[PDB]
Design a protein around this ligand. Structure first.
Ligand SMILES: CCCCCCCCCCCCC/C=C/[C@@H](O)[C@H](CO[C@@H]1O[C@H](CO)[C@H](O)[C@H](OS(=O)(=O)O)[C@H]1O)NC(=O)CCCCCCCCCCC
Ligand SMILES: CCCCCCCCCCCCC/C=C/[C@@H](O)[C@H](CO[C@@H]1O[C@H](CO)[C@H](O)[C@H](OS(=O)(=O)O)[C@H]1O)NC(=O)CCCCCCCCCCC
Lengths: 209, 207
């Protein structure tokens, strides 16, 4: 874990445009969040979210100036691929990535807000389930949804998850949550803006895996 | 095709050349794309990962690791406490089980094994393979994950068509070709398992 208060996202400008370059650099630090769950069953997840970032970084690298914002990627790739857009290139990679980013976002906000099953307060299952539901559930068929619920056991204890995050520092659970809460700030704002862009561009697809 | 990329027959001393073992097995991971589902992508990725770790250790010194047995001999001397849960020994320890999964599964279909109520499914075949290669190394969470994924298995007819692809071969001619591949294949795997037993190189930990 890279320390997330050390890798804040940029604030939103008046025009709401997100610079691809700093965005990807920022989000490259996030896939290790899945190592903090403490189980090999989450490694396909880590690998899949990395995949997206890698693809967007690759496309970006081709021409940093033409793909300078995220809005650009969608515009330019639509000229490139025509009718096949948006199921293509970095538009497709950011479509799925924005969903995993929202999972991390809703999940952490949940843990920060103190949400919990009162019967089982050192579990993180209700936080995960809520995150999953409002970020991913909709784009998963029967099989992957059953795979999710199997995988929800083998989620760690809250205290252990929060201890896995805070690694390198000598920081308390409530201080760690302070650093997370500050991260969430431009993180949420930015994810929110990407979702609206997908809606405005008609780049959002509903197909299930 | 698995057909053409046959494994070499074993020599009488039973040592497996590391180079040529890696060439052969490297054709195998596209076995899971014959399953026609994204759910199998992480399986394919794990097997490929084993192959690569072995490929890599081999590459630091081809001559020191001419054989797979050589690999296990060297790495024992090299790590003591950590071995066999280390390096290419761990990679091959797991590769062999995926290899046995493929072996057992294809043998099952070739033998005509089927559920008579669902004869165009391959669920019984995959279960048998899973039970006799992998299941005992998975905890109940992972096993529950296998039983969910099993519903993404393709139909037998489609699965055999994917195996065939470019050919114009019957379902049966396809199977005929697979039987030929299984001969040298089963035997090499058998020998790898045996080497892991003689070397105390086997671990029974569950994931
Ligand atoms: C015997 C045992 C063997 C059984 C094997 C069974 C394995 C089955 C499990 C597979 C699930 C792994 C997660 C990744 C699934 C992915 O398939 C999907 C769609 O994946 C996308 O697909 C696109 C094409 O449609 C592009 O290729 C994308 O890529 S592109 O770069 O080409 O554009 C790619 O990410 N991603 C998504 O569902 C998102 C990833 C999952 C997010 C989950 C986060 C929350 C989880 C809760 C944590 C408590
Ligand atoms: C949206 C919801 C999110 C949920 C997503 C969760 C996805 C679930 C992930 C589990 C499925 C992936 C299969 C991989 C499981 C692996 O955990 C194990 C152990 O794997 C080994 O671990 C070692 C350390 O102990 C080394 O790292 C190995 O490697 S090393 O190279 O580093 O030495 C590594 O292969 N492999 C294995 O269990 C076997 C491989 C799979 C074979 C299965 C074939 C059966 C398929 C049936 C087809 C009909």
């Amino acid at each position: 874990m890279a320390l997330l208060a050390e890798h804040l996202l940029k604030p939103l400008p008046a025009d709401k445009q997100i610079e691809t370059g700093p965005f990807l650099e920022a989000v490259s630090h996030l896939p290790p969040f899945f190592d903090c769950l403490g189980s090999p069953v989450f490694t396909p997840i880590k690998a899949d979210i990395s995949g997206n970032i890698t693809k967007i970084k690759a496309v970006y690298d081709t021409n940093p100036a033409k793909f300078r914002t995220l809005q650009n990627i969608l515009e330019v790739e639509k000229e490139m691929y025509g009718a096949e857009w948006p199921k293509v290139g970095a538009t497709l990679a950011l479509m799925w990535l924005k969903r995993g980013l929202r999972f991390i976002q809703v999940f952490l906000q949940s843990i920060c807000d103190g949400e919990r099953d009162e019967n089982h307060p050192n579990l993180i299952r209700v936080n995960a389930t809520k995150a999953y539901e409002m970020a991913l559930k909709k784009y998963h068929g029967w099989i992957v949804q059953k795979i999710f619920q199997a995988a929800l056991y083998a989620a760690p204890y809250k205290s252990d998850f929060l201890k896995a995050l805070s690694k390198g520092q000598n920081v308390t659970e409530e201080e760690c949550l302070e650093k997370i809460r500050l991260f969430l700030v431009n993180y949420t704002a930015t994810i929110d803006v990407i979702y609206e862009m997908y809606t405005q561009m008609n780049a959002e697809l509903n197909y299930k895996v």
